[PDB]
């Protein structure tokens, strides 16, 4: 109300409204689902088009051979944060001959987002990210909020109507975690999860975007007729 | 190579009874080559006179600099700068270029307008003040000038006698220096009149 003019102002109840307004931009964004087993980690994203002539906005970005994310909210902010992740992954490889741990990647994103919430002039990031990756401790899935809060999860979903997919994953938890050494079945569970967040529209060939990383699987994105198999 | 002896030239200043005198040669050269016989090395800001020997570009630059500074001084102080004060200004200005100095040998001469006291001073290229009672010398024939001044000078000379002493000191010193000569000027300075005299000398 009087305490939402900038990010540097707490409300009387201890709230940061600009951060909450940035959080709101994610809810307006298109749905994207993340889930993993012990061998693989999968991103599924519902891409959004402007109209019938337009292309479908890309949702998934590769950060390294073993790591990448899906976005929901302001796409340019995801480009900035993903670029930063690419650099940090790359710094780790060049300097230490070491693949960046997914947990450490989350810590770096948290701290970068935090600086934008405590300083005058700037603004919070207006995007949410789902980071998947396979490192020395197996498969991983993270959820990034532009408040700075990063959370390691078995499965999750962010964007509009994401609650439906999130409840499904909460039921299916014991099943999909056990899908080891079977990428196609893990993606199926992700496609079935994101389907719980659909209304009116359905998953078409240029609508759906899937990415996977695993034990002997580099981070690879599937679009177009490559995802027709899963429709 | 040595910046203080590329262009050549000399300045000498002397005190007398209720008067000062400052004099200089007129030569500017490029080592062996004589370039100008009209290069005057004495300047004045109000009633304060400044002679400058050494590298000619710096002679010109410093003259323009002290004109600049004494003009602003006058506007703010609402009075002309005095020899004692100007001497400190020259010293300060040279020392601020301690590790990139002007290659010059300045000589201040004048009479304090309030006390009427004759005043002369000399400096090294870096600002060290030599405030002698008798005489100050500078330039490529400074040794020759020291010799001439030391023997010819006597205290409390009248203006017209001082003219003869300083003139003969300059002329004969310049004639023993390859890089000095080609004409000479002598200023005779009294409290409220200044006479400038060009001397006839050998032109080789």
């Amino acid at each position: 109300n009087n305490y939402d003019g900038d990010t540097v102002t707490f409300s009387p109840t201890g709230r940061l409204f600009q951060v909450e307004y940035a959080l709101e931009a994610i809810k307006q964004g298109s749905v994207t689902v993340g889930l993993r087993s012990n061998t693989h980690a999968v991103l599924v994203a519902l891409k959004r088009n402007a109209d019938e002539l337009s292309s479908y906005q890309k949702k998934i970005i590769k950060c390294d051979e073993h790591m990448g994310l899906s976005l929901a909210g302001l796409a340019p902010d995801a480009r900035v944060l993903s670029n930063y992740l690419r650099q940090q992954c790359n710094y780790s490889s060049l300097v230490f001959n070491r693949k960046l741990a997914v947990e450490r990647a989350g810590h770096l994103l948290c701290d970068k987002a935090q600086k934008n919430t405590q300083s005058y002039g700037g603004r919070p990031y207006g995007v949410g990210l789902l980071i998947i990756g396979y490192d020395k401790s197996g498969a991983h899935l993270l959820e990034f909020q532009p408040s700075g809060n990063v959370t390691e999860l078995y499965g999750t979903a962010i964007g509009a109507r994401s609650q439906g997919a999130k409840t499904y994953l909460e039921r299916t938890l014991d099943t999909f975690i056990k899908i080891d050494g079977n990428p196609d079945e893990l993606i199926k569970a992700g496609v079935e999860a994101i389907s719980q967040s659909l209304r009116d529209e359905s998953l078409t060939v240029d609508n759906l975007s899937i990415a996977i990383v695993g034990k002997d699987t580099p981070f690879t994105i599937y679009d177009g007729e490559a995802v027709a198999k899963y429709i | 190579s040595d910046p203080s002896s590329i262009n050549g030239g000399i300045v000498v200043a002397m005190t007398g009874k209720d008067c000062v005198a400052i004099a200089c040669d007129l030569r500017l050269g490029s080592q062996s080559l004589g370039v100008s016989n009209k290069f005057e090395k004495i300047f004045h800001y109000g009633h304060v006179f400044l002679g400058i020997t050494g590298l000619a570009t710096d002679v010109t630059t410093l003259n323009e600099m002290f004109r600049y500074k004494t003009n602003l001084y006058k506007l703010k102080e609402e009075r002309a700068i005095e020899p004692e004060t100007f001497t400190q200004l020259v010293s300060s200005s040279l020392y601020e270029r301690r590790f990139g100095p002007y290659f010059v040998g300045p000589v201040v001469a004048g009479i304090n307008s309030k006390s009427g006291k004759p005043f002369i001073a000399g400096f090294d290229l870096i600002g060290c003040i030599d405030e002698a009672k008798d005489f100050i010398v500078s330039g490529t024939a400074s040794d020759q000038l020291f010799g001439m001044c030391e023997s010819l000078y006597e205290p409390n000379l009248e203006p017209e006698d001082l003219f003869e002493t300083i003139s003969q000191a300059l002329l004969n010193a310049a004639d023993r220096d390859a890089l000095s000569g080609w004409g000479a000027v002598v200023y005779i300075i009294k409290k409220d009149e200044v006479v400038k005299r060009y001397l006839k000398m050998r032109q080789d």
Partner: protein
């Protein structure tokens, strides 16, 4: 470059400058004009290190032309020469100094007088009846000292200049490929196309 001469006569200034451009072993050009018009009644000739000469001359030209437009007024030769001296005096204590020597020949329209200024790369300015840079003076000054008169005509100045050039062509080891001669007077700047 090599030889640049200047002579101020009764009603004009004459600048003579060599045409040769030598890059070590070969003479690459024999028609080079070592001069720039700074203003309608002010000409500057130049000689020194390669590149620096033209870079400096054109930089000065641009600055004087800028002043001319801003004030709708031509600076006096004295004012132009003082500006040029300061630039060179600034340059000598720079990281990499301009190695350029210049002569500034101008006609002062206010005073109705020709004026010749000699300035070396150190910023050493002198106003002269006749001047030169480098070794040019060593050969020519004895002739100029002898023959020069302040009331000379332009035609007499050119004759005395020819004698100077002939002496240079006789005793100088380098072939400077003749000179381009330009005259600065009340009507402006013109080139003597036959010399």
């Amino acid at each position: 470059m090599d030889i640049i001469l200047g002579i101020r006569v009764q009603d004009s200034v004459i600048l003579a400058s060599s045409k040769a451009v030598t890059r070590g072993i070969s003479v690459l050009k024999d028609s080079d004009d070592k001069t720039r018009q700074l203003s309608p009644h002010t000409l500057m000739s130049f000689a020194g290190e390669a590149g620096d000469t033209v870079q400096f001359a054109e930089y000065i030209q641009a600055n004087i032309q800028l002043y001319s437009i801003r004030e709708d007024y031509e600076l006096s030769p004295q004012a132009v020469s003082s500006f040029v001296r300061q630039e060179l005096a600034k340059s000598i204590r720079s990281r990499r100094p301009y190695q350029v020597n210049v002569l500034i020949g101008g006609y002062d329209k206010k005073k109705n007088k020709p004026e010749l200024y000699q300035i070396d790369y150190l910023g050493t300015k002198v106003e002269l009846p006749y001047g030169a840079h480098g070794y040019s003076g060593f050969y020519t000054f004895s002739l100029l000292d002898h023959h020069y008169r302040p009331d000379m005509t332009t035609e007499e100045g050119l004759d005395l200049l020819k004698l100077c050039v002939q002496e240079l062509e006789k005793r100088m080891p380098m072939d400077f490929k003749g000179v381009i001669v330009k005259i600065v007077d009340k009507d402006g700047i013109r080139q003597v196309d036959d010399f």
